Amino acid sequence: KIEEGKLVIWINGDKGYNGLAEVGKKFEKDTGIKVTVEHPDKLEEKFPQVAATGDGPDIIFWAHDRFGGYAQSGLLAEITPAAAFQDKLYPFTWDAVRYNGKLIAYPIAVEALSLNKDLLPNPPKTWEEIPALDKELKAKGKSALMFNLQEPYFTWPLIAADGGYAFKYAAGKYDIKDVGVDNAGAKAGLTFLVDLIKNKHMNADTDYSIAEAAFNKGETAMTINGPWAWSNIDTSAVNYGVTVLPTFKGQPSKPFVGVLSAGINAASPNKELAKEFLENYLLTDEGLEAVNKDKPLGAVALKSYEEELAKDPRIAATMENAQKGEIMPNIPQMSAFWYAVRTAVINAASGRQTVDEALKDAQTNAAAAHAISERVEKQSALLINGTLKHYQLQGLEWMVSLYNNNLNGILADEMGLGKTIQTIALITYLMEHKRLNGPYLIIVPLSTLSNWTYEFDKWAPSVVKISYKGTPAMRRSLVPQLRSGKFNVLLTTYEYIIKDKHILAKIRWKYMIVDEGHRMKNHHCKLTQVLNTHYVAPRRILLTGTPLQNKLPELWALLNFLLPTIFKSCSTFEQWFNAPFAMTGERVDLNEEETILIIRRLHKVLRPFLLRRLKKEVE
Amino acid sequence: KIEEGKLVIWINGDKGYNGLAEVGKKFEKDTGIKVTVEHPDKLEEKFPQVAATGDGPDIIFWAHDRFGGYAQSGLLAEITPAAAFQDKLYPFTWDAVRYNGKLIAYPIAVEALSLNKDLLPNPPKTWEEIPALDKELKAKGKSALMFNLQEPYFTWPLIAADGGYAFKYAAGKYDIKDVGVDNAGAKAGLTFLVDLIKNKHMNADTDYSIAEAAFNKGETAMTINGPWAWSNIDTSAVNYGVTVLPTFKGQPSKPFVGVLSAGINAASPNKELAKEFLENYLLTDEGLEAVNKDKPLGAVALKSYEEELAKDPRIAATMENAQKGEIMPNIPQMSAFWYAVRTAVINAASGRQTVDEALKDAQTNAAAAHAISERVEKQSALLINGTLKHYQLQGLEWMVSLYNNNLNGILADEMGLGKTIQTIALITYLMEHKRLNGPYLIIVPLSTLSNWTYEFDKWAPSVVKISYKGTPAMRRSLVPQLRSGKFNVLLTTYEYIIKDKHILAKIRWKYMIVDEGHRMKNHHCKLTQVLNTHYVAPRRILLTGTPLQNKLPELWALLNFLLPTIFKSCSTFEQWFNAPFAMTGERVDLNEEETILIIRRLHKVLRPFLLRRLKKEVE
Ligand SMILES: Nc1cnc(Cl)cc1NC(=O)Nc1snc(C#Cc2cccc(CO)c2)c1Br
Ligand SMILES: Nc1cnc(Cl)cc1NC(=O)Nc1snc(C#Cc2cccc(CO)c2)c1Br
């Protein structure tokens, strides 16, 4: 499992592992405690699996970002250094490892992007200077700049300069709704990049197999890259150097900062052994120096050893950039943002789209509710006794996208498209692929209660269920089985949710699923608000025959179901929608026109939270 | 002024004053302290004038309602009885004398409305019984009921029964916005009253000169009236009695409860002398009994003497009604409500309007922003060197209505209608008629600054003013004159409000007046929000040439000026108006249609807060 009185560390093969191994030796020497350092193939992939298991390493070495997910999962321990130790490192590095306002790793090294010696004797202080400068090198049958364009990481620092960002860092928390891809900053920066392409200075087709393949063959004078390039510009022996990034609009170009970190497994019994090894054997000028010798670690988190490294201009440069630039977010919403801005630039620079066009889309696509994309190739293992149709599996993919992105929703497919089976599919895939085995609540009408059991018994026999129904004395018989929580699903009706509330409200239901049935019935809000009062249900799903209704009362109750907390005190849609106009004590109901545009806006709002397919487009 | 070591009490001539005088004798007997009891003509009118002066009586005797205004003005002292004394009286009576959650009088007597002995041997338990019963007395060439209809006090108890009220009593405070004249309760009650008129049982023309003139001549069997009638039904010696009010829809008919009270002048030096006389000489079974002998006081607040009075069915009846019925509100908004419901009934019952029609209007007219009506016949005394035109004086009447009803507003009359003079008129009438002499703030543009001084110097020379302007060293010279507060008005410009804020924000400005000038300029909200941040100004007035603009930005800033507090955190109109739709993290600006109806609603909202007359309709 996870061996006591010893230390097993995972660090990638690209890093100076054999150097780290030596630091482990001095530990075992002065302490006797064995230290094993391994570089497992695709270790960052293997780590979460084995961590939930209670296996794996005691110490993990990867960038502070990938640690966010591990921290969300709780696979990393809250590191406890005293104040004095925190002063030994830069405060900005401790930020990179702070999750939910708790330190979850030890910051180690720092990497960023940075800016020839002969050809370019003096470097351009402002970005604005580069056209004049290019005319000179173009007159020499060459160019002044040729970095990677086709990728967004390299092209983002000027977009970031004037005030263009990804997620607005709140209190101690990023906001995935406050996205800065459409502000003047981003537009000034991206317009300028397209300015160089249209003025023939820079080519739009410019990728990495050119970014490096030209600056190394003496074709260009300047380039924007990181430490992984330095070693290949040494091979071609071109007289090079690195420096700070230019001030576009009298503002510094902000690149993304990667902080190599050491995290301790929440499963590892040797937590004080790891704090002792890290705080006293690794996070020391001597300890860091030891690793740096096998493969350099660029800038370091440690103030003391950083000054000694700042002797080299190259390291003092990346570190200067770092404090002025910005740290990579640990939040999963990054995959959307990068995909958004990747395409934004390709288009804007190719001519296919206007700067204001590409950035308009990129900003929307990244702030999108279904940001976390997750492919579902095949059904659950627990999902047997039949193979789902193409769309039913597609239905599960949107429902797991609902789960991953922590959103509630509606499956409004036409009756007889297998919504029942589709729910069953979500519940199984949420056990066989995620560790969500917790109490599922399923509210079905009497008339289909029995069919719901029937289909579970067929397709997912593994899923054990309580079927909350019967005489008062029969319902009582079930009372213990709940307290046990040996069940995955409970099935019951609208009647028992309200009547036997004093027993069913008591459970912390992981997922709540309501099946409206066949009957096209208009629902009142008074009831949903009452369900809301007593029931803890983070993830909600609604299954309905009917599509989105064009009636405010129904839409009002739909929102109270979909967003339970938000409308706590406010009981009516009238109170809610008059509110921006209510501040004069005037009490007037909405009119016909006012109402039409409210319904209009509500349909556009609920738009990404509903899924509906029709028999006529399927078969 | 207000003589020490003595007591002067005011009670009306209609009450048992010579009986109260005797209670004063026993005080002087056992204490030596002289007690003088006077019944001044229109004493409730004379009291506020003389109380603000620091003159008048030490003790005042009137109903708990008229004491609300005296309490708002602070002409009555916070009475301090210990817990034990409060138990001697009913808790519902102590409510009647609680203003701003402070006891401000001593409850004394209780009066209400109540319900023949022979003709009607058994009284009708339910209101619903009266048609069947009327058929009997109509078969005897008479009628079963003939009370006052033309008045609203008498007709309100059934309107009140099912749930029809005037002002929703909050925490310990009435809500003049939460008015219950349009609910099902009021409609069930008022429909029933019209049911009797259309079925020829009751006549719509029925007034007091019939309500009494018929029941006393043996014409009718039942009537709804109060204690002031009892004495005249004794003269005609008709075998009568009083009882509880019927249950319409299985609910008791709620009438209005008048609580005769004893208030102590906040000016009176003899505050402990009055508490001693009241708590120990008047509010005793023996003390109350003494007054009751000159002229009866119906039900009493005192538990102990009330049981002894409950021997008479008549008193135990009014007291039963009282606890089930409701107490008269002390708030000034009553004049609107009564005028609203007075006409509502006249119409509904005459046929001129439908129940749903009259009550629709009555509910609106009573919840109206300009509820407190106050006539202004002639201008101020301090307003000389010219006589105002008809509309300019009308302008002052709407501006004092703005003041009385504690509302901000706009005077958007066409340039050259004498808005300047009209402001001057409000400022003077607010000194000569109200004691508002406090610091007035007036913001005028540079170009008219000098004309503003000029017109004051002409019309209101009495009004002394600081004219905040000049070089830094000249502005400094004024610094003391402000700290003094020997001035009524300060005149200054937009420039000095922001620049010399660190000096002008420090004053608690009673009224703030902004004169937009002539220039049709579009105003930004960023500035009004900044003015709002640092300035204390309860009453605001805006003077402008231009009428209400059809642009959301301008309307947004207008609301921040008009309602300063309300939009504290919310900076934009976009954030504010998307808010009921914002709860999904979606950030989308309003469209063309959405915007049109917002402007629409805002114009209807601001409608009662703007005054505009045009040259073309005046001359
Ligand atoms: N489909 C559709 C399209 N468009 C519109 Cl506008 C409305 C639509 N339907 C809809 O909103 N359904 C809703 S809303 N609240 C509920 C609920 C509930 C509930 C569940 C269990 C117990 C209790 C208390 O007894 C209440 C339902 Br079910
Ligand atoms: N007339 C009219 C009709 N319709 C619409 Cl939509 C808008 C209209 N005008 C209007 O709203 N005026 C407003 S709004 N806020 C202000 C203000 C102010 C202010 C005063 C002193 C100092 C500072 C800070 O320097 C600011 C004014 Br003045």
Side-chain angles (χ1 to χ4, degrees):
Chain A
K1 203 178 188 176
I2 195 134
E3 206 165 334
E4 218 186 305
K6 199 224 170 165
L7 286 173
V8 181
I9 314 155
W10 292 0
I11 190 150
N12 212 82
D14 83 302
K15 314 268 109 77
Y17 58 95
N18 289 140
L20 187 86
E22 327 291 78
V23 199
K25 263 77 167 283
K26 191 65 173 178
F27 197 72
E28 202 172 334
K29 192 192 206 289
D30 322 346
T31 73
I33 319 297
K34 206 201 177 183
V35 171
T36 295
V37 168
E38 241 134 43
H39 50 96
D41 216 305
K42 288 170 145 194
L43 59 109
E44 84 294 5
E45 309 213 301
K46 288 166 164 176
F47 184 86
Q49 313 169 226
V50 309
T53 308
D55 278 48
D58 304 79
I59 307 163
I60 185 79
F61 273 92
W62 210 262
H64 65 117
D65 34 281
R66 192 128 194 178
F67 283 25
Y70 302 152
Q72 204 46 89
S73 314
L75 323 171
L76 309 176
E78 210 278 300
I79 57 118
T80 55
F85 189 78
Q86 274 188 266
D87 296 283
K88 296 166 181 76
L89 317 175
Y90 296 121
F92 87 89
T93 62
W94 282 123
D95 286 0
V97 303
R98 216 175 288 99
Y99 201 90
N100 291 316
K102 291 156 166 282
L103 313 113
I104 63 109
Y106 282 116
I108 308 295
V110 162
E111 61 154 7
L113 291 137
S114 286
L115 193 48
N116 196 288
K117 282 243 279 161
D118 220 344
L119 275 283
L120 175 98
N122 208 248
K125 267 269 179 88
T126 82
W127 256 115
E128 297 94 316
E129 289 183 12
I130 285 68
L133 215 140
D134 187 57
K135 250 194 169 182
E136 271 74 86
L137 271 120
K138 273 205 165 190
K140 302 260 188 81
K142 294 294 193 172
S143 58
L145 175 63
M146 269 164 96
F147 71 104
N148 187 3
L149 282 152
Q150 299 270 292
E151 272 302 286
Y153 175 59
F154 304 99
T155 57
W156 179 261
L158 32 60
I159 310 179
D162 193 85
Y165 62 94
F167 307 87
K168 206 272 168 189
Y169 197 86
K173 185 222 163 61
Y174 290 100
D175 184 9
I176 57 155
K177 294 298 155 196
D178 203 356
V179 172
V181 175
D182 259 357
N183 49 31
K187 281 172 176 199
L190 193 50
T191 47
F192 191 74
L193 206 78
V194 184
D195 291 349
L196 258 92
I197 316 274
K198 68 195 194 184
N199 291 24
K200 291 98 195 165
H201 302 161
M202 274 212 285
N203 167 20
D205 296 82
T206 318
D207 51 87
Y208 208 84
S209 302
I210 300 158
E212 206 168 28
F215 187 73
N216 289 242
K217 293 283 165 182
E219 290 184 84
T220 195
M222 300 172 283
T223 192
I224 311 103
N225 215 311
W228 58 92
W230 297 12
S231 314
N232 280 278
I233 323 151
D234 277 318
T235 316
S236 284
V238 181
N239 200 26
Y240 76 92
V242 326
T243 184
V244 77
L245 301 186
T247 60
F248 188 91
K249 294 167 107 277
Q251 287 147 308
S253 308
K254 299 178 183 195
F256 272 118
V257 195
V259 182
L260 193 78
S261 301
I264 57 174
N265 198 342
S268 171
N270 317 309
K271 289 169 180 102
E272 254 67 277
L273 209 77
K275 163 147 139 98
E276 201 199 300
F277 171 77
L278 299 163
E279 288 185 18
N280 322 309
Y281 279 68
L282 193 60
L283 282 174
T284 48
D285 339 317
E286 35 259 296
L288 294 168
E289 189 211 304
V291 184
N292 191 53
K293 265 200 173 182
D294 193 26
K295 265 136 181 192
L297 320 159
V300 302
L302 197 74
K303 296 180 165 159
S304 40
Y305 187 46
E306 186 46 34
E307 281 109 10
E308 220 250 62
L309 289 157
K311 284 184 189 181
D312 185 349
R314 299 203 286 182
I315 280 71
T318 69
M319 172 53 69
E320 204 180 73
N321 285 345
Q323 300 146 309
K324 275 277 212 170
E326 271 308 333
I327 41 178
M328 259 292 212
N330 39 24
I331 52 100
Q333 293 80 16
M334 221 58 205
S335 221
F337 167 85
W338 287 114
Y339 261 97
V341 202
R342 187 178 86 165
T343 190
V345 191
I346 303 148
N347 299 13
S350 87
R352 258 180 275 102
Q353 272 193 285
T354 227
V355 153
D356 296 60
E357 257 153 59
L359 287 176
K360 220 203 196 168
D361 311 334
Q363 136 79 240
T364 322
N365 296 168
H370 284 286
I372 308 152
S373 223
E374 203 240 75
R375 178 179 66 190
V376 173
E377 283 261 312
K378 56 185 179 176
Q379 56 190 92
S380 185
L382 319 153
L383 191 68
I384 44 91
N385 274 318
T387 299
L388 264 50
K389 278 269 150 194
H390 182 41
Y391 78 96
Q392 298 192 116
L393 195 93
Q394 284 187 318
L396 157 83
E397 206 193 48
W398 177 91
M399 275 187 290
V400 300
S401 227
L402 261 206
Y403 163 92
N404 283 165
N405 287 276
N406 312 320
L407 318 153
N408 287 2
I410 302 112
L411 189 58
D413 294 323
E414 282 205 74
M415 290 324 286
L417 277 164
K419 266 140 84 265
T420 288
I421 299 86
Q422 274 180 119
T423 306
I424 294 156
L426 160 113
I427 310 151
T428 61
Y429 199 94
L430 255 39
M431 291 158 179
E432 122 103 336
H433 281 88
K434 315 275 174 255
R435 295 158 70 112
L436 185 71
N437 301 2
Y440 292 87
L441 194 45
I442 317 186
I443 315 84
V444 302
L446 232 183
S447 326
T448 70
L449 166 60
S450 312
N451 196 89
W452 264 93
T453 108
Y454 192 121
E455 282 295 283
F456 263 117
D457 292 328
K458 176 190 174 205
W459 299 84
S462 163
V463 183
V464 297
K465 52 240 162 77
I466 300 166
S467 319
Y468 197 86
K469 51 103 186 290
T471 64
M474 288 187 75
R475 256 132 54 202
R476 284 154 184 168
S477 155
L478 293 169
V479 160
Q481 245 265 260
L482 279 153
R483 271 95 74 91
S484 319
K486 296 164 95 165
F487 77 101
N488 309 260
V489 168
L490 180 137
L491 284 123
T492 198
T493 197
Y494 297 70
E495 178 182 42
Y496 289 139
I497 284 296
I498 64 169
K499 289 175 187 180
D500 288 1
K501 65 175 177 77
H502 76 276
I503 134 104
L504 296 149
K506 264 80 167 180
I507 304 92
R508 60 155 81 259
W509 306 99
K510 307 286 170 287
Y511 241 112
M512 166 183 263
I513 291 116
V514 181
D515 170 75
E516 263 193 57
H518 316 277
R519 304 284 199 273
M520 210 271 209
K521 291 177 141 268
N522 62 162
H523 327 89
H524 204 280
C525 196
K526 289 215 170 196
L527 295 160
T528 185
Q529 287 192 324
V530 162
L531 148 93
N532 264 6
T533 290
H534 320 271
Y535 283 81
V536 167
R539 289 194 185 87
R540 295 186 168 192
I541 294 179
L542 191 74
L543 323 152
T544 188
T546 122
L548 216 29
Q549 290 303 290
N550 245 80
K551 286 153 270 155
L552 197 40
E554 281 53 72
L555 278 165
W556 173 243
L558 185 56
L559 296 160
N560 289 254
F561 176 79
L562 269 210
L563 316 158
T565 5
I566 295 171
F567 323 86
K568 190 153 185 179
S569 82
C570 187
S571 56
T572 88
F573 59 75
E574 280 293 354
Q575 202 223 286
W576 184 262
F577 294 113
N578 296 351
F581 310 105
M583 74 310 167
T584 54
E586 282 157 74
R587 299 204 287 163
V588 50
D589 298 322
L590 305 157
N591 67 21
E592 213 185 318
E593 322 88 289
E594 291 183 304
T595 295
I596 295 172
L597 299 176
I598 285 173
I599 289 145
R600 268 239 243 290
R601 188 75 97 107
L602 291 177
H603 275 223
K604 202 182 169 182
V605 158
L606 293 164
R607 198 247 312 131
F609 308 95
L610 198 147
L611 185 51
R612 178 170 168 89
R613 278 88 38 98
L614 314 151
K615 289 186 273 125
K616 86 111 151 163
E617 68 183 30
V618 167
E619 204 195 355
Chain B
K1 203 178 188 176
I2 195 134
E3 206 165 334
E4 218 186 305
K6 199 224 170 165
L7 286 173
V8 181
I9 314 155
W10 292 0
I11 190 150
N12 212 82
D14 83 302
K15 314 268 109 77
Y17 58 95
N18 289 140
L20 187 86
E22 327 291 78
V23 199
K25 263 77 167 283
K26 191 65 173 178
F27 197 72
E28 202 172 334
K29 192 192 206 289
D30 322 346
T31 73
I33 319 297
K34 206 201 177 183
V35 171
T36 295
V37 168
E38 241 134 43
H39 50 96
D41 216 305
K42 288 170 145 194
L43 59 109
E44 84 294 5
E45 309 213 301
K46 288 166 164 176
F47 184 86
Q49 313 169 226
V50 309
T53 308
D55 278 48
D58 304 79
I59 307 163
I60 185 79
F61 273 92
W62 210 262
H64 65 117
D65 34 281
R66 192 128 194 178
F67 283 25
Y70 302 152
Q72 204 46 89
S73 314
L75 323 171
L76 309 176
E78 210 278 300
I79 57 118
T80 55
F85 189 78
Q86 274 188 266
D87 296 283
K88 296 166 181 76
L89 317 175
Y90 296 121
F92 87 89
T93 62
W94 282 123
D95 286 0
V97 303
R98 216 175 288 99
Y99 201 90
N100 291 316
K102 291 156 166 282
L103 313 113
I104 63 109
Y106 282 116
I108 308 295
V110 162
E111 61 154 7
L113 291 137
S114 286
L115 193 48
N116 196 288
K117 282 243 279 161
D118 220 344
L119 275 283
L120 175 98
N122 208 248
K125 267 269 179 88
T126 82
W127 256 115
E128 297 94 316
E129 289 183 12
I130 285 68
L133 215 140
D134 187 57
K135 250 194 169 182
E136 271 74 86
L137 271 120
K138 273 205 165 190
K140 302 260 188 81
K142 294 294 193 172
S143 58
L145 175 63
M146 269 164 96
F147 71 104
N148 187 3
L149 282 152
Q150 299 270 292
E151 272 302 286
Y153 175 59
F154 304 99
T155 57
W156 179 261
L158 32 60
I159 310 179
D162 193 85
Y165 62 94
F167 307 87
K168 206 272 168 189
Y169 197 86
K173 185 222 163 61
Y174 290 100
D175 184 9
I176 57 155
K177 294 298 155 196
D178 203 356
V179 172
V181 175
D182 259 357
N183 49 31
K187 281 172 176 199
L190 193 50
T191 47
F192 191 74
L193 206 78
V194 184
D195 291 349
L196 258 92
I197 316 274
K198 68 195 194 184
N199 291 24
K200 291 98 195 165
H201 302 161
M202 274 212 285
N203 167 20
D205 296 82
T206 318
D207 51 87
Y208 208 84
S209 302
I210 300 158
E212 206 168 28
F215 187 73
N216 289 242
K217 293 283 165 182
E219 290 184 84
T220 195
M222 300 172 283
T223 192
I224 311 103
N225 215 311
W228 58 92
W230 297 12
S231 314
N232 280 278
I233 323 151
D234 277 318
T235 316
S236 284
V238 181
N239 200 26
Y240 76 92
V242 326
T243 184
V244 77
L245 301 186
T247 60
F248 188 91
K249 294 167 107 277
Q251 287 147 308
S253 308
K254 299 178 183 195
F256 272 118
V257 195
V259 182
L260 193 78
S261 301
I264 57 174
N265 198 342
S268 171
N270 317 309
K271 289 169 180 102
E272 254 67 277
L273 209 77
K275 163 147 139 98
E276 201 199 300
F277 171 77
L278 299 163
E279 288 185 18
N280 322 309
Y281 279 68
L282 193 60
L283 282 174
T284 48
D285 339 317
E286 35 259 296
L288 294 168
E289 189 211 304
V291 184
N292 191 53
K293 265 200 173 182
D294 193 26
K295 265 136 181 192
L297 320 159
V300 302
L302 197 74
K303 296 180 165 159
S304 40
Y305 187 46
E306 186 46 34
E307 281 109 10
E308 220 250 62
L309 289 157
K311 284 184 189 181
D312 185 349
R314 299 203 286 182
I315 280 71
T318 69
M319 172 53 69
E320 204 180 73
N321 285 345
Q323 300 146 309
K324 275 277 212 170
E326 271 308 333
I327 41 178
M328 259 292 212
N330 39 24
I331 52 100
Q333 293 80 16
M334 221 58 205
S335 221
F337 167 85
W338 287 114
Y339 261 97
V341 202
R342 187 178 86 165
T343 190
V345 191
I346 303 148
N347 299 13
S350 87
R352 258 180 275 102
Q353 272 193 285
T354 227
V355 153
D356 296 60
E357 257 153 59
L359 287 176
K360 220 203 196 168
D361 311 334
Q363 136 79 240
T364 322
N365 296 168
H370 284 286
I372 308 152
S373 223
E374 203 240 75
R375 178 179 66 190
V376 173
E377 283 261 312
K378 56 185 179 176
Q379 56 190 92
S380 185
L382 319 153
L383 191 68
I384 44 91
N385 274 318
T387 299
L388 264 50
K389 278 269 150 194
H390 182 41
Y391 78 96
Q392 298 192 116
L393 195 93
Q394 284 187 318
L396 157 83
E397 206 193 48
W398 177 91
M399 275 187 290
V400 300
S401 227
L402 261 206
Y403 163 92
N404 283 165
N405 287 276
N406 312 320
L407 318 153
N408 287 2
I410 302 112
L411 189 58
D413 294 323
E414 282 205 74
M415 290 324 286
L417 277 164
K419 266 140 84 265
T420 288
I421 299 86
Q422 274 180 119
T423 306
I424 294 156
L426 160 113
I427 310 151
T428 61
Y429 199 94
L430 255 39
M431 291 158 179
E432 122 103 336
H433 281 88
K434 315 275 174 255
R435 295 158 70 112
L436 185 71
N437 301 2
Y440 292 87
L441 194 45
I442 317 186
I443 315 84
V444 302
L446 232 183
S447 326
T448 70
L449 166 60
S450 312
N451 196 89
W452 264 93
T453 108
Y454 192 121
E455 282 295 283
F456 263 117
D457 292 328
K458 176 190 174 205
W459 299 84
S462 163
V463 183
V464 297
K465 52 240 162 77
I466 300 166
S467 319
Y468 197 86
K469 51 103 186 290
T471 64
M474 288 187 75
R475 256 132 54 202
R476 284 154 184 168
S477 155
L478 293 169
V479 160
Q481 245 265 260
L482 279 153
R483 271 95 74 91
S484 319
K486 296 164 95 165
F487 77 101
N488 309 260
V489 168
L490 180 137
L491 284 123
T492 198
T493 197
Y494 297 70
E495 178 182 42
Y496 289 139
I497 284 296
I498 64 169
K499 289 175 187 180
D500 288 1
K501 65 175 177 77
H502 76 276
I503 134 104
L504 296 149
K506 264 80 167 180
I507 304 92
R508 60 155 81 259
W509 306 99
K510 307 286 170 287
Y511 241 112
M512 166 183 263
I513 291 116
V514 181
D515 170 75
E516 263 193 57
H518 316 277
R519 304 284 199 273
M520 210 271 209
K521 291 177 141 268
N522 62 162
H523 327 89
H524 204 280
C525 196
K526 289 215 170 196
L527 295 160
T528 185
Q529 287 192 324
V530 162
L531 148 93
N532 264 6
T533 290
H534 320 271
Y535 283 81
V536 167
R539 289 194 185 87
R540 295 186 168 192
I541 294 179
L542 191 74
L543 323 152
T544 188
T546 122
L548 216 29
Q549 290 303 290
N550 245 80
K551 286 153 270 155
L552 197 40
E554 281 53 72
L555 278 165
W556 173 243
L558 185 56
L559 296 160
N560 289 254
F561 176 79
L562 269 210
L563 316 158
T565 5
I566 295 171
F567 323 86
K568 190 153 185 179
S569 82
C570 187
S571 56
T572 88
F573 59 75
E574 280 293 354
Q575 202 223 286
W576 184 262
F577 294 113
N578 296 351
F581 310 105
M583 74 310 167
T584 54
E586 282 157 74
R587 299 204 287 163
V588 50
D589 298 322
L590 305 157
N591 67 21
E592 213 185 318
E593 322 88 289
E594 291 183 304
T595 295
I596 295 172
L597 299 176
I598 285 173
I599 289 145
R600 268 239 243 290
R601 188 75 97 107
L602 291 177
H603 275 223
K604 202 182 169 182
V605 158
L606 293 164
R607 198 247 312 131
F609 308 95
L610 198 147
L611 185 51
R612 178 170 168 89
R613 278 88 38 98
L614 314 151
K615 289 186 273 125
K616 86 111 151 163
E617 68 183 30
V618 167
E619 204 195 355

